[PDB]
Each structure stands twice: as structure tokens, then as C-alpha cells.
Amino acid sequence: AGQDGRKDGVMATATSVSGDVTFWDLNKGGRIMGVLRSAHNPPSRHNIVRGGISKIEFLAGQPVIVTSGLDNSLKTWIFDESPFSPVPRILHQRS
Amino acid sequence: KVDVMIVHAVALLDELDKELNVMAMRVKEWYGWHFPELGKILPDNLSYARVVL
Amino acid sequence: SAAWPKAEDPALVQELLDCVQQASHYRQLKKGANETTKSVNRGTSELVILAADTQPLSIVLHIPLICEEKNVPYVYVPSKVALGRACGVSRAVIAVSLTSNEASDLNSKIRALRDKVERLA
Amino acid sequence: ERSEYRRQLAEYLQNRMKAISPNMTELIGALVGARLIAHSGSLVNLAKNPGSTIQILGAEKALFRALKTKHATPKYGIIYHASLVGQASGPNKGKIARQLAAKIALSVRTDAFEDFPENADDETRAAVGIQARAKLENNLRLLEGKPLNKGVALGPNGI
Amino acid sequence: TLTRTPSKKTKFVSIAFQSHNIVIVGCSNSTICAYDVRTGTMLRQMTLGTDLTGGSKNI
Amino acid sequence: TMERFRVSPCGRYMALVASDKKGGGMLNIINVGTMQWIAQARIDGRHGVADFAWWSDGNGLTIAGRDGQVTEWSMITRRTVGIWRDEGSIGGTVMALGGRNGPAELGGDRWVAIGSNSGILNVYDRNDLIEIRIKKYPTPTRVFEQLTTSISVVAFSPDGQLLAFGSQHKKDALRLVHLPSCTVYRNWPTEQTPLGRVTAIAFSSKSDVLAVGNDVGRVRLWEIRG
Amino acid sequence: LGYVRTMRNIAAKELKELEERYVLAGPKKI
Amino acid sequence: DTHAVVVAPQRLAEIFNAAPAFAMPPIEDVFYQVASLFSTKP
Amino acid sequence: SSLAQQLAQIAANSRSSFNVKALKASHSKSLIWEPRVAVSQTFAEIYSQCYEGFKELCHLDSRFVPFDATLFSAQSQEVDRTQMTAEENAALDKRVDSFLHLVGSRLRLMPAIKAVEWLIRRFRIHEFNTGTLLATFLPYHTIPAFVTLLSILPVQRIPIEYRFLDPYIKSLTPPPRAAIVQQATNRPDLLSAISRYTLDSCRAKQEYPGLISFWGGIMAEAVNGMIDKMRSGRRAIQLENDHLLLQQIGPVLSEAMVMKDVPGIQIASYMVVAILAAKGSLNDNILTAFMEQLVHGWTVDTLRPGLVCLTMLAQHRSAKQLSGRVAKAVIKVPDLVSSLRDISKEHQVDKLANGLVLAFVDRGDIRTLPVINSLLLSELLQEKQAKVAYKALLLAAHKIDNIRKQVGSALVRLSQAEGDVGDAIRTAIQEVDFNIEELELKLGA
């Protein structure tokens, strides 16, 4: 957190009407820091394609963060360090 | 405004600088018999003639 | 002003531009002040066209002296940027000058053109 | 006495040069402009030169050797010792050589033919050389600050 | 001589004065030239088309 | 021939061009009320009339004749309003005209585009055109020179906003100019966007659709969403 | 090209000189 | 109606790379220069 | 050679030499003298010369005395940073940082340079606080000092953003500002880093106009280029890139506008947001957000340039009204009409003024009336603007439930306005078809 990756207090929020997850940096007054846009498929009522996101865990102690949705997909994402990353990159996926 | 002055002037300046050079080295040797280390310490011939004065 | 062999006659100017354009396709034409003066000093030239509306006119006023000496005709168009994109280079040439070769209908057109200029004189 | 005489001579040269051709000494400086006019013979004798002639004004043996045997042409003459080109560098020195050439030919024709209504201040008289000074010094600082070629930044490993 | 026309086939036939300084000539290659006399310049070239009854294009 | 013609936006008149060059070209005005001859505007030139367009009210029409003369020739007076010059282009090939809140006594069209043979295409403003006395040398709003050959389509988004101008002689000469800011676009058309050898363009009346067509004889279409 | 031009200039001057010399060596009068 | 301006990045870079950072003319002055460039006023 | 990968990881992550050869070179890297003396320069004379320069600096500027106590004492003359513990090292690092932020002002002065040379040849600041020193020298990036530092910098030690100076290390010439700004445009991290450095300084009240001018210039050109990249054509990527640029710049921008103490840096934030709205076609909520923030943040010393920014913001806006506290503060602005006339002499304040008067007629308070009349007689609005302003004014006088006396005095003043403003007012009355005489008798009776 703190736009330099050094500080702590990051949290992840998820809906189930979209498929985009959001990352806040809590430190000064709780600013936003980013959006993993469309981690899963975006949910739609008119569309056959299922979407929507079930749950998100930051697993303890490590910067991985596991997401699953409705659309039969379990992905895992990770922050790097030496480039600071606002949004993570994918480091496993199973669909 | 005529420039025959200009061309004459620069011919004169070039020849002048050259003769200043040769007479400056002339007086350099001409005092170096009395004091050669002066010419060694001072390379600027103008100041050199100045201190000879 | 000083541009005393002015050519404002419209069909005359159009013939001059078109002849320049043809000559530009025949590589027999030099584009620019400096090159014009080189061509006339080396004498190869046979006609020279300038532009009246340059802001300091003096950068082309040196040409008529030389061409009066070495005896080649010169004549002013009124529009520099017209001359430039007449050459076909997109930047306003201020001075173009086009020369002779042995056997060319373009050489003939040049001769009739300088006859027209001597008429304008 | 000879030295002081030469010093005041040079004073005269600069002043009289400002009197005759203010544009050119607003570009380059009275001494090198004087050298030019000298090899010219006259002001108009200069002003019938083209820009490339001014670019290599002087280097006559070198030029004609390289041409008459097809070697690489000399890049400049007295403009090398002229003041503005010393702040370029190398390939930049060549580019400044060309640009200073053409703008000098401009200034010389300007002062050599453009009349002035004689209630004419020297600054309004030499505005074109001033313009040339400004534009050109800007271009010189640009090409001086041209970047270098980005290379891939190697870390500790070959990675 | 005020001026002459560019080409050599431009024959002059008719003349009349619009105003003090403004002369009008009508001329062989289907043209009506309006010259200003004082400077002697060519204010405007009026122009006429082809005589589409008989041959001999130039009206 | 009755090859070239253009109809008034008011839809009452039609203008045909007389195939008779001879020092100056003329275009006849024909009522489409009764398909009758009612006027004949004559402009000077050296070859006749390159192109022309109806002013948006209809009252006059602008005639871009080769060697860059632009006549503006009224209808209600039915005599020439004014004469001026494209800024020194050797041979005008196409013009067109559009925009809104231009000067009403020139019909109330705003931007006027003129395309050379040499390829350079100028854009002028008509509230700038007035010195009734006309500016004989409008310094042009801009002098666009992205293209490099002879301009063949110059057309206007009929809501006076986009400008399309395109040369046919080389593959893919179609460039798109935003207005009134007069900046040519970058993101279109790209190296791989299939135009061809553009021969005729047309925007919709709503100016949502663009259609373009080429020497193979095929039409492409683009939605124009800002 | 540069070489060709120089030699062209020199020969042009020489033709000028020789033409002058030829003429001075050698319905006209009314 | 008004729109987003269009500027030559060479012009903006010229503004700043005119002079070194120290002894650059002060910030209000340079701000007036730059905003005058970006001004939407004919 | 996966072994060798691991080993070179460690060996460039080293922090202390262990063969004498690398020891001697590590000692001989220095700024003032040459290597071939700095080798056997022992650790007294270094402290001698550098402390002399230190005295010069301390007699110039006052607040160097705690650094005299803690970083230039005779025990510091032989403290060996290499052998303390980590938290010690970090506290030391904080002291190092604060010293750099204070000293970077007087950088073109030889005693300052000598002070930094002491820091390097003793604490190896260039090796263990690399990013900070590179940060505080980057503003002077044209000068011989910067090139010399560039020479002595350790390569793999250079922070990951600033790695792009390596070809200049291969060719010891200073980089130019265009090169810096291009790397600044491509990366977010370098720009974040520069901004965070200079923010640390101005949080510390140690800024100075050269550095602030530097930072403003580099931020401005970088943001220009960044919007040049972010343009898409495609609707979603344009939106998401607007979001992204806003994330990377917002917080810095926030504290930079709101830092009431530092005048130039407030002007700099004004500059950069002016460009941001001026070329970045942005959305009215965000625009109003910036407006409200600089509204909260400005000073009187920054007031006229912030007002220029206000003009630019509201002019690039799409809606026609302002959000409240903006009107409150512009009410608080004293010399409003004079100032905007001087601004509109080059800047076209129209939409700004329209939003002002619209908010004022929404205000229902009656301390805004002289303001309202002044802007109406200003001759700054358009004809339709003045007319619809009068329309909403009469509609406010209709919806109001004294207040009527004040609005009637205002109304008769504006109806009896003389010039083209009065003509447009009476035009509005003529199209609204309500009786000036009815309201005149109703208020005069």
C-alpha cells in the first residue's frame, strides 16, 4: 500500500452482479487502488454465458489471492514486487 | 558603406598579429640571456613584455 | 516595387507553372534560391522564375544582377507557395530556375517562354 | 604599443562592422564576418554567393583536391572558428554547419540589398539576424539534447 | 507602351473606357481584358466561349 | 454531356455543367420544378469548372474552377457575388462545402474545402472570407497536406462536423478531418483497414453511417460513434 | 557528380575563351 | 460549443526544455505561458 | 547454470566487500579527488575537508545543527555502517534521507558537494540509499556533479525504475530532459517515485523553487504524453484508461493541491490539472471533483492562477451549472469581476461565469444579489446566457414565498440596464411575455 508497495492495508471486494474485483489501499483515508476487470466472465441475464463471482480469499501470509465464480472457473492471481502491481497477474487457472 | 577599409583592415590585422608574434619571441630571447626562467614561468608573451617593462 | 518584370497576366502565369511542372518531371529544373544562383553562375540555366511576395525581398534581389550580367531572362510570379507546390515538393519554393539540354520539346517550350518574357519586358 | 594598437584596431573593426552589416555580426561576430568579406573582395561579391559556397568559404585547396580526385568533401571553412558552431558536437557540428551556412547567406543578402528609411534603429535594422540567432540557438540546444538509444536494462543474471 | 498581351495571337479589336483609369479592350481569343491604365496592370480577364454555330472556335 | 450535376438542398434547382471549356466554363441552372433552363452562370478559368456546391439555403452556389478561382455566384441576384482565390494551387479538382452558422449572405454554410490537383487540400472559413466585398486572398484556415495525390472525393458530414477527403489514385487515400478543430485523425484509417482505391464516399443524413467505395466496385460501411 | 561538374565548369570557361579568340581572329552594313 | 484542445507536444517540451530547472523563471510565469498555450480562445 | 543464477543474485545483493581488491575500489569511488589519491586517503583528512565545507554550509543555513551532532561527529568519523543491525540501519537511513532533502537546495555550491562526498566515502550513501540520492540529484541533471555521480554509481544497485541511465553510465554524458520524460511517460513507477520524493520534501517544508519547477515540468509533460497513449477510439479502453490514469495521479494530485503552505507546488498542481482537463476529455463528475478540491485548497497567493484553472475547468465541462461550495468560495473571492475581465482578456471565461450566476440564482439567500447584478452587467455572458439567466431569475422571484424587495430592486436595475446587456434583458422580457410594469407597480407599491 501507499503507492510504493511497502505499506500494508489492502483489501479486495467482490460483487456477484459483475465479474470485476476491486482493490482498495486503506492507508490515508481508504483510497481505491484498482480493478481486476473481468476476472471471471461478466454475468448476464439475457446471455447463455454464465458469469458472476462467488468468493475471494487472500490466502494468509502470501500475496496470492484465489477467486472463483459461477462460470466453472477457479483462477489464482498474485502481486509481484519489483514492479509494484496495482492489479495482480494470473498464476494459475483452471476452467 | 565601403568595405575597402574592411579588407585592408583584416590584411593589416593578420600581418600585425604575426609580426607581434615574431617580435614577442624576439624580445623573449633578448631577455632570456639575462633571465630565461622568466620566459619559462610566463608563457603569455604580452604579460612577459609587460614584466620586462 | 522592385519586381519590375512582374508577370500577373493569368494565362501567362499558368503557362509558366505548367512548363515548370513538365520540367520538374524532366529533372531539368532547380528548386530553391541557392541552387538557382549556382545554376546561373555555372551558366547552364536558361530561364529563372522568382516569387514577388517573400517577406524580405532582398534574399532574391541578388539574382537579377547576375542574370543581367550573364544574360538570361528572369521574371516574377506573384505567389511563392504556388510555385512551390508547382514543383511538387509541398514547401514554398521561392526561386526556381530551369535549364537547357540538346534536343527536347521542353527546350522548345523554354524558348517560346523566354520570348514571352521578352515580350513582357 | 603594437599590442594596444591591435586592440583598438579590433575595436574599430567590430564597430565599423556593426555599422555596415549588422545582420551578419548579429549572427556570427565581426571578426569572422570580416574574414568572409575579405575573401569575398566585397560585400556584394559575397552576396552573390550561394549558401553552400558560404558553408565552405575558404577551404579551397582541400575542396578542390577532394573533388578533382573524388574524395570526401570538407565540411566547413572559417565557420569552424566562428562562435556558434563551437557549442555543437561532431555530427551536430556538421548539421549546424549547414544551417549556419544558409542563414548567413540570408543575412548577407538582407543587409546587402534591403534598404532602410534611415530613421532606422540598428535593432529594427538587424531584427532578421536576431530572429536567426534565436531560432538557430534553439535548434542547437535541441540536437544537443537528442536522447540516446534505449537498451534493454540487464539485471543480475542475464534476465 | 502600357503593356502588351502575353501571346502573339491576341489581336485587339475593340476599345472603350469604363471610367477614368479603367480601360476595356475586346480581343481576338474570345476575351475581354480589363486593364488599369495608370500602373498598366491587368485588372481582370473576362472570357467568352466557343461559337457553337460555325467552326473557328475562338469567338 | 450532362455528366456532372448537383441539386440544391432546397431541391428546387439543379446545376448542369456545360462541356465547353474555352477560356471559361459555365454551369446552367435548371428548375426541377419544370426541368427548364433558368440561369447560366459563367466563370472564367483556363479549363472550365472543376466542381461546385449548393449553399445550404440554396440561394447561391459556389463554383470552384480550375486554376483555383472561386466564384461565388448568387441566384436571387443571379449575378456573381464575389471572386477570390484558393491560395495558389495549380489546378483545382474538387471542392465541397458545409457547416453551420457561416455568414448568412453567403448562404450560411461554414467550412469550405478545396482540393487541388497536386493533392494539397485547403479548408477555409467563410466568415473569414468577407472583407459586398470579398477577401481576394483568404489565408486558409488550414492547408492540409497529409495526402500526396490528386484529390477526388471531398465530402462533408451533413451536420457540419466531420470532413472526409480522399484521393483515389493510390490505394487507400482516405483521410478524415475533425472540425472545427481541423486536426486530422490518427486512429483511422489504419494500415489494415480495408478501403481500397476510394472512388466515392457518402455520409448518412443522420451522419451515423459512412459508406465508401472503390475500383473493384464494392461498398464498405462504418458506424461513426464518437 | 561533383567531379563531373567541376570539369564541366572548367571546360565551359575554356570554350568561352576559345570562342572569344575565334571570333576576334574572325546584309551586314547599310 | 467547446471541445478538448489539441497541442503540439513539441510545443510543450519546448516550453520546459527552454531552460534548466534551477533559475527557470518562476512557476506563476510558466503557468501563464502554458495555460496561454492551452487556451481555448481564438 | 542455475547455480550461477543463485550466486550472482547473492553477490550483487552483497553489501560488504571481502577481497581486498573490491575493498580498495569500493573505497576509491569518490566525487572530488581522483581515484589514484582517494585510494590511500585515510579517514582523517576526508573528515577534515568535508567538515570544513560543513562549517561553511552551517554558517550559511541554520537548521543543519542536528545533522552536525549526529552525522558529522568525530565518532561518526569512524562508525562502520556495515556492522550494525537492520533497525539501526533504517534509522540511519531516515537521518540520511532528511539530510539529503535539506541539502539538495544548495547543490551547486562546493561545500554542499563536499558534504555529500563525506556521506559517500563514509556511509556509502550511493550504495545503500541509492534511490534517494538519485532522486535528489535528478533535478540538477545537466550538471557536472550529476555526471560524476553517474560515474560512481553502482549499476545493479540503481533502483529498478532508474535502471534506464545505464547507457549513459556506459557513455558518461548527462541524459537530457526529454529522455527522462520519455521514461516517465512509459512507466508509472518513475513518475510515482519523483512525485513521492518531492511530496516528502514539501511535507517536510524543505522545498525550493528550482525543485518544484523541475517537478512541475516533468509531471506536466509526462501527463500530456500519457493521455496521448491512453487515447483509444474504442469506448471501453478509453474509459478504463481514464480510470487508470486517474488512479496513478489522483493521490499525488490531491495532496499537491491541498498543501496550503507551498505556493509554487500549488500552482504546479493547478498547471497539471489544467492540462489534464484541457486535453483529456473528462467527465463532469470528475471535473467538478477537481473544482471542489482546488476550491477547498487555494490561497490568496495562488488565487489568480487557481482562478485561471477554474475557467479552464468549467469551460471544458459539459453541463452548465456548478456544485455549491464552488459558488460559496467564488463568493468569497473579492475582486471577482476585475479579475475575470483580466483573465478573459486572454482566456474566454464564459461557461465559468454562466455556472456562477446559475448557482447564485439557485441561492435561496439574498447576499448574492450585488454579485449577480455585477456579473449581469459584466458583458461576459452570451445573449442566450444572459437571457436564460434573467429567465431563471424571474422564475426564482416567482417561486419565492424583504426578499421580494431585494429581488425587485435588482430586477428594476437590470431592466433599466443601458447597453446591449439591457437590450438582451428586455428581449428576455419580451419573449417571456411577463409585465415589467406589473412587477414594477407590485414592488413600488
DSSP states of A5-27 as a string? S-S--EEEE--SSSS-EEEEE-S
CB of D157 within 8 Å of any CB in chain H? no
Residue showing cell 462536423:
F161
Q: Which residue, D149, A33, H14, is CA-closest to I220?
A: H14
How many Å apart are CA I430 and CA I436, to the nearest integer?
Answer: 9
Q: Which residue, A90, A89, A18, is CA-closest to A54?
A: A18
Report yes or no: I82 and I15 within 8 Å, Cβ to Cβ. yes
| Strand arrangement, sheet containing F209-214 | F198-203, F209-214, F219-223
Helical residues (DSSP H) of B1-53, grouped into ranges: 4-32, 36-41, 45-52
CB of D68 within 8 Å of any CB in chain I? no
Task: State the distance between the two ends of chain G, measured CA to CA, in whole angstroms.
Answer: 50
CB of A7 within 8 Å of any CB in chain I? no
Q: Which residue, I174, E30, I418, is CA-closest to D147?
A: I174
How many Å apart are CA D33 and CA D46, to the nearest integer?
Answer: 10
Contact call for D138 and H14, based on CB within 8 A: yes
Cell of I93: 537511513
Partners of E47 in the β-ladder: E31
How many Å apart are CA A78 and CA F215, to the nearest integer?
Answer: 54
Partners of D77 in the β-ladder: none
Q: Which residue, F61, F64, F59, F76, is CA-closest to F28?
A: F61
How many Å apart are CA D20 and CA E6, to the nearest integer?
Answer: 42
Residue numbers preceding breaks in chain A (C to N > 2.5 A): none
Contact call for C37 and D128, based on CB within 8 A: no
Say what angle helices B4-32 and D2-20 make with each other, to 10 degrees: 160
Contact call for C119 and E8, based on CB within 8 A: yes
H14 chain-D contacts, CB cut-off 8 A: 138
| Beta carbons within 10 angstroms of residue I206's beta carbon | 17
Q: Which residue, I90, I84, I80, I195, is CA-closest to I135?
A: I195
C43 φ/ψ sector (left φ>0, alpha ψ -120 to 50, else beta): left
Using CB atoms, pick whichever of I108, I216, I347 lies closest to residue H27: I216
Q: Which residue, F162, I193, D15, I179, is CA-closest to A84?
A: I193
| Strand arrangement, sheet containing A31-36 | A10-13, A21-25, A31-36
**Subunits close to E (at least 3 CB pairs below 8 A):** C, F
How many Å apart are CA I262 and CA H27, to the nearest integer?
Answer: 12
- How far apart, in Å, are the Cα atoms of I115 and each of I91, I111, I132? 20, 6, 16
H/E stretch holding C107 reads helix C105-120
How many Å apart are CA I233 and CA G20, to the nearest integer?
Answer: 74
CB of D153 within 8 Å of any CB in chain I? yes
Report yes or no: A68 and A54 within 8 Å, Cβ to Cβ. yes
Partners of F177 in the β-ladder: F163, F184
Contact call for D146 and I176, based on CB within 8 A: yes
Concatenate the DSSP letters of all residues of chain F into one string: ----EEE-TTSSEEEEE-S--TT--EEEEEETTTTEEEEEEE---SS-EEEEEE-SSSSEEEEEETTTEEEEEESSS-SEEEEEE-SS-S-EEEEEEE-SS--GGGTS--EEEEEESSS-EEEEESTTTB---B-SS---SEEE-S--S-EEEEEE-TTT-EEEEEESSSTT--EEEETTTTEE-SSSS-SSS---SEEEEEE-SSS-EEEEEETT--EEEEE---
Nearest CA in chain I to A31: I251
Q: Which residue, F71, F72, F69, F102, is CA-closest to F87?
A: F69
Contact call for I233 and F225, based on CB within 8 A: no
Amino acid, single-letter form, for residue I124: R
Q: Which residues of I141-168 are buried (b: 16+ CB within 10 A; e: fewer)?
A: bbbebbbbbbebbeeebbebbbbbbbbb
Resolution in A: 4.7
Question: What is the SS3 assignment for A65?
Answer: strand
Report yes or no: F65 and F45 within 8 Å, Cβ to Cβ. yes
How many Å apart are CA C72 and CA C61, to the nearest integer?
Answer: 15
How many Å apart are CA I146 and CA I152, to the nearest integer?
Answer: 10
Q: Which residues are CB-contacts of A73 (< 8 A; sequence separation ≥ 6)?
A: A40, A41, A93, A94, A95
Report yes or no: C52 and C25 within 8 Å, Cβ to Cβ. no
How many Å apart are CA G25 and CA G12, to the nearest integer?
Answer: 20
Distance from CA of D138 to the nearest CA of H (A): 8
Distance of CA C39 to the CA centre of its chain: 12
C12 chain-E contacts, CB cut-off 8 A: 6
Question: What is the SS3 assignment for I301?
Answer: coil
D20 chain-B contacts, CB cut-off 8 A: 1, 3, 6
- How far apart, in Å, are the Cα atoms of I188 and each of A90, D21, I185, I385? 21, 54, 7, 43
Question: What is the SS3 assignment for I218?
Answer: helix
Omega into C10 within 30° of 0, i.e. cis? no
Residue from F1, F17, F22 whose CB has the most chain E CBs within 10 Å, to mutate:
F22
Expt. technique = cryo-EM
H/E stretch holding E22 reads strand E22-27
H/E stretch holding I54 reads helix I45-60
Contact call for H3 and F183, based on CB within 8 A: no
Distance from CA of H14 to the nearest CA of I (A): 10
H/E stretch holding C47 reads strand C45-51
Nearest CA in chain H to F184: H6
- Backbone torsions φ then ψ of I300, nearest 5 degrees: -80, -25
Concatenate the DSSP letters of all residues of I231-276 into one string: --SSHHHHHHHHHHHHHHHHHHHHHHHH-TT-HHHHHHHHHHHHHH
How many Å apart are CA F28 and CA F18, to the nearest integer?
Answer: 7
Residue showing cell 568559404:
D57
How many Å apart are CA D2 and CA C98, to the nearest integer?
Answer: 55
How many Å apart are CA D88 and CA F148, to the nearest integer?
Answer: 36
Say what angle helices I303-316 and I263-279 make with each other, to 10 degrees: 10
| Beta carbons within 10 angstroms of residue I208's beta carbon | 17
Question: What is the SS3 assignment for I379?
Answer: coil
I177 chain-D contacts, CB cut-off 8 A: 145
The one-character DSSP state at I162 is: G
How many Å apart are CA F41 and CA F70, to the nearest integer?
Answer: 13
CB of F117 within 8 Å of any CB in chain C? no
How many Å apart are CA I269 and CA I256, to the nearest integer?
Answer: 6
Q: Which residues are CB-contacts of C5 (< 8 A; sequence separation ≥ 6)?
A: C74, C75, C76, C117, C120, C121
Contact call for F116 and C85, based on CB within 8 A: yes
How many Å apart are CA I151 and CA I225, to the nearest integer?
Answer: 30
Q: Which residues, numbered 152 to 191 in chain F, qualify as contacts with chain I under a Cβ-Cβ cut-off of 8 Å? A: 187-188
Contact call for B9 and D13, based on CB within 8 A: yes
How many Å apart are CA I22 and CA I16, to the nearest integer?
Answer: 9
CB of I5 within 8 Å of any CB in chain D? yes
How many Å apart are CA A60 and CA A48, to the nearest integer?
Answer: 36
How many Å apart are CA E35 and CA E33, to the nearest integer?
Answer: 6
Cell of I272: 497539471
Report yes or no: I233 and I175 within 8 Å, Cβ to Cβ. no
Q: Is G2 exposed, middle or buried (0-12, 13-18, 19+ CB in 10 A)?
A: exposed
Contact call for E7 and C11, based on CB within 8 A: yes
Q: Which residues, numbered 21 to 40 in chain C, qualify as contacts with chain D under a Cβ-Cβ cut-off of 8 Å? A: 33-35, 37-38
Residue from I224, I270, I271, I380 whose CB has the most chain H CBs within 10 Å, to mutate:
I271
Q: Which residues are CB-contacts of B50 (< 8 A; sequence separation ≥ 6)?
A: none
Give CA angle at F121 (F119, F127), nearest 5°. 165
- How far apart, in Å, are the Cα atoms of D86 and each of D79, D80, D83, D90, D140? 9, 7, 6, 10, 11
Strand pairing class (C45-51; C74-77) = parallel
- How far apart, in Å, are the Cα atoms of C29 and each of C43, C53, D53? 13, 21, 20
Partners of E27 in the β-ladder: E12, E31
Report yes or no: F150 and F116 within 8 Å, Cβ to Cβ. yes
Cell of F168: 483515389
